[PDB]
Structures are given as C-alpha cells and as structure tokens.
C-alpha cells in the first residue's frame, strides 16, 4: 500500500558483514571510539543519569560530559544507508513503574488486562527517550527472555551506529541510536506462542544534533 518498506536481517553472518561494512566507513576518531567503549561499560548508569536529569548534562561530572558530547557528535558520522528494522527487549518497568509488578501471570504469560492498559497509555502516541537506545540488527538471544520486544522502523539516513566491533562489551550486532530520540508507537500485540508484547514503532529522530 502506501506504507514504507523496512529491511530485516535474517542471516547473522550477513548482518555482521553489513554492519562491519558501515563501520569501516565511519572514520571514527580514537576519542569517539573510546567514548563508545565507555558507554558499553556503563550504559545502565549513563542512561539512568540521562533519564533522571531529563537530558540535561550540565550537572554531570566533567569527564562524563566530555564522553556524552563525543558520543553525541559521533553520530554525525554514523548513519544507516537502508530503511532497517532494529530490535530490543525490555522489562515491565519500561511501560512504567505501575507495570513493574502487574504485567505477568504466574506461568510466564502476560495478563491481558495489564496489556490493555499498556495500549491506552502508549498506542498511537510519541514517546521521548532521554537515554541512548541500544538495539540489535536481529532479535538476538540476549532477548527472548524479556516480556517486551520492540521493533523500531529506522529510515535511510537516520543516525544509527553499528558498535558491535568497537567494544568487547557491546551487544551482539548492537546498533546504537542517539539519546533524546522520539518515536511513535504504531502497533502493540501479543506474541502468538504463549503471550508476550511485541511493539512496533517508527523512529522519528533525535533532538541532539551538534554542529
């Protein structure tokens, strides 16, 4: 129809080759790579601070400010040449503290009532994320244990970096997205296998554009 087409990697060997190919052309500086390595080693803490302070970094320790600004600007060199689907998994808290202990039933499946509340709260609305967004080119094993799977539709030209080869601690086929990014949740449904929430969203972009 009038919908756009987003590619999805289904072969890990090619996803790795494709990502490696993009990486080879970034021309990242030594300090930019170190910033990315540092991010992979303290992602939880950095994103936690970003959320806590709503994206304002002036109060962060000087060293962290430098790291964040380096990472922010590194995206000027990292764009995806294709419309691509990116994946990530999340725990109930992602939907809000109110679901942290209400989304799942004692058997693995997810309560339908809580799920219905999740839709009214997020379906057909823009969502702003203060932290950076770690994703993978494929639905890697690192997930499949999380109750929430999000599929982001990222358009050609968007800021997105394949950091899998930059850090020993990056996730498998990890594609990092800029912080302070907004996306629109287009669809929310249960997995057809024993309940699970599959979220499909269109990535709109980031407000962090240095230069």
26, 77 in Cβ contact below 8 A?
A: yes
Structure tokens that stand for 109 in this block:
């499946």
Find the catalytic residue in 32, 38, 74, 88: 88
CA 48, CA 43: separation in Å to the nearest integer? Answer: 8
Return the DSSP state at 177.
E
Q: What is the DSSP secondary-structure string of 79-114?
A: B-SS-EEEEEEE-GGGG-TTTTTTSB-TTS-B-HHH
Q: Chain centroid to CA 34: how far?
A: 20
158, 80 in Cβ contact below 8 A?
A: yes
- Annotated binding-site ranges: 40, 47, 51, 88-91, 127-129, 143-146, 172-174
| Residue 179 designated active-site | no
Residues across the chain: 211
Number of domains composing the chain = 1
198, 113 in Cβ contact below 8 A?
A: no
Find the catalytic residue in 134, 136, 158, 181: 134
3-state secondary structure of 171: coil
187 closest CA partner among 206, 169, 205, 200: 200
Find the catalytic residue in 32, 136, 158, 174: 174
| Residue 88 designated active-site | yes
Q: Which range marks the domain in which residue 202 is found? A: 1-211
CA 189, CA 86: separation in Å to the nearest integer? Answer: 17
37, 113 in Cβ contact below 8 A?
A: no
Resolution of the PDB structure in angstroms: 1.7
| Residue 189 designated active-site | no
Q: What is the CATH number of the domain that holds 3?
A: 3.90.176.10
């Amino acid at each position: 129809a009038y919908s756009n087409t987003y590619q999805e990697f289904t072969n890990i060997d090619q996803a790795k080759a494709w990502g490696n190919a993009q990486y080879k052309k970034y021309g990242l500086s030594k300090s930019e790579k170190e910033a990315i390595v540092s991010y992979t080693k303290s992602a939880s803490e950095i994103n936690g601070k970003l959320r806590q302070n709503k994206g304002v970094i002036n109060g962060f320790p000087s060293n962290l400010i430098k790291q964040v600004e380096l990472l922010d600007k590194s995206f000027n060199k990292m764009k995806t040449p294709e419309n691509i689907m990116l994946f990530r998994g999340d725990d109930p808290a992602y939907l809000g503290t109110e679901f942290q202990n209400t989304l799942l039933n004692s058997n693995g499946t997810i309560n339908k009532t809580a799920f219905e509340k999740a839709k009214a709260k997020f379906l057909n609305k823009d969502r702003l994320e203060y932290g950076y967004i770690s994703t993978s080119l494929m639905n890697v094993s690192q997930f499949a244990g999380r109750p929430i799977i999000t599929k982001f539709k990222v358009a050609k030209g968007s800021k997105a970096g394949y950091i899998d080869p930059i850090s020993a601690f990056a996730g498998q086929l990890e594609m990092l997205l800029p912080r302070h990014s907004t996306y629109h949740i287009d669809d929310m449904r249960l997995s057809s296998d024993g309940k699970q929430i599959i979220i499909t969203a269109t990535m709109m972009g980031t407000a962090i554009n240095p230069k």
